[PDB]
Design a protein around this ligand. Sequence first.
Ligand SMILES: C=C1C[C@@]23CC[C@H]4[C@@](C)(CCC[C@@]4(C)C(=O)O[C@@H]4O[C@H](CO)[C@@H](O)[C@H](O)[C@H]4O)[C@@H]2CC[C@]1(O)C3
Ligand SMILES: O=c1ccn([C@@H]2O[C@H](COP(=O)(O)OP(=O)(O)O)[C@@H](O)[C@H]2O)c(=O)[nH]1
Length: 408
Amino acid sequence: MHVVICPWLAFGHLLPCLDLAQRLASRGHRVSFVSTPRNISRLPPVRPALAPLVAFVALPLPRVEGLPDGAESTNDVPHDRPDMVELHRRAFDGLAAPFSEFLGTACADWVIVDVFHHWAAAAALEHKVPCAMMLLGSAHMIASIADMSLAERFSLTLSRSSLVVGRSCVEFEPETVPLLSTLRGKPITFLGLMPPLHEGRREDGEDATVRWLDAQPAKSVVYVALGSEVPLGVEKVHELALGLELAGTRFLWALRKPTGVSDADLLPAGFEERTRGRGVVATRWVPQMSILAHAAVGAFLTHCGWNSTIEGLMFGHPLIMLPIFGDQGPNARLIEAKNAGLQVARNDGDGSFDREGVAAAIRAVAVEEESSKVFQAKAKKLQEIVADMACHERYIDGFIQQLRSYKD
Ligand SMILES: C=C1C[C@@]23CC[C@H]4[C@@](C)(CCC[C@@]4(C)C(=O)O[C@@H]4O[C@H](CO)[C@@H](O)[C@H](O)[C@H]4O)[C@@H]2CC[C@]1(O)C3
Ligand SMILES: O=c1ccn([C@@H]2O[C@H](COP(=O)(O)OP(=O)(O)O)[C@@H](O)[C@H]2O)c(=O)[nH]1
């Protein structure tokens, strides 16, 4: 089959979509990976064996006054500037006509579109190409939802599609997957957990963060990362920093800067001087898969993005959970219910946290001998499911067969 994939302009979408593209190409299907040029230039390379079977289709973002050139993704357009978020949505919607022009002559068997691709789903109707909408999260998240604004963009994409695709399986969510049939009348299918393949990202194993981990004791380091886009304002950064310090563990923190904040204002006064001997802060993109694979990493302080949840558990790390938005709350509650992580205490109403809550969660998951042992054992039970690579390849096979059967 020729499958056209259209990920949302966000690295939590682009990365699993490029993994899915290569998995499809590995079974001898061909993929057109449709995105914008700077987003494509920042992606891991396709294996030489798959080069002619994964075609990158670069559609330039139209120019919009107030949106900087090269600001193509949620990693480049910060949530803490809602005016720029809106300009980026306008630019994204401007891809409609070029996408429809591409699709008409593409000889596509399927289009797989992301949650806000209402125009791509409209093009698939116009060109009589079956269209699957990606909702690459948990069955629990899809069940939550089942129970131009984002909700309206989502609703329109869904209505125009034929199929909804989740990223889970009955082994991981036995309570939910059998209960799901349709989402607003559309059949739901699960393509498995699709944990990333060994070195699919071709990260730098000589990265300064990994060389620091090489020097630390086994399972001694709390890795701290909040994915590629969620906002954390400078006051919240300071509470997270002081909580990490207070709990006393070794730490490696991949931190994105709030907009406007100088390196000098980013962290509490003296925090890096005091913690230099046990912790490292990196304000750049880090090789998260190399870090989570590392023997030095014990617990993962995560925002519970679905990629980070899967990546943490595929190496049996218990989670210290700080959900910020979207599916993160549902993801954190799902893992807490499996006893493999603990959420940081939040104020009910505004969802605030403080250094004491951060420190208390770190001590419970990573330090206290009895609780930490149970969290580790429960995370290892989940790793048996998440890291069953053969199980997840069978689900990819099953997904391809379901795409084939709709055509026939
Ligand atoms: C009523 C609602 C249900 C809701 C659940 C979460 C859901 C939606 C945002 C739809 C898309 C997927 C998902 C899981 C989500 O949070 O996606 C994320 O949205 C961000 C923008 O908010 C993007 O920048 C991210 O890249 C994307 O990963 C969805 C629709 C609007 C909402 O308010 C929230
Ligand atoms: O410094 C970073 C930050 C994030 N990631 C990767 O970016 C993705 C983040 O996706 P997730 O669903 O966890 O959160 P989002 O960014 O969508 O909020 C994951 O695959 C991470 O491995 C990374 O490699 N390095």
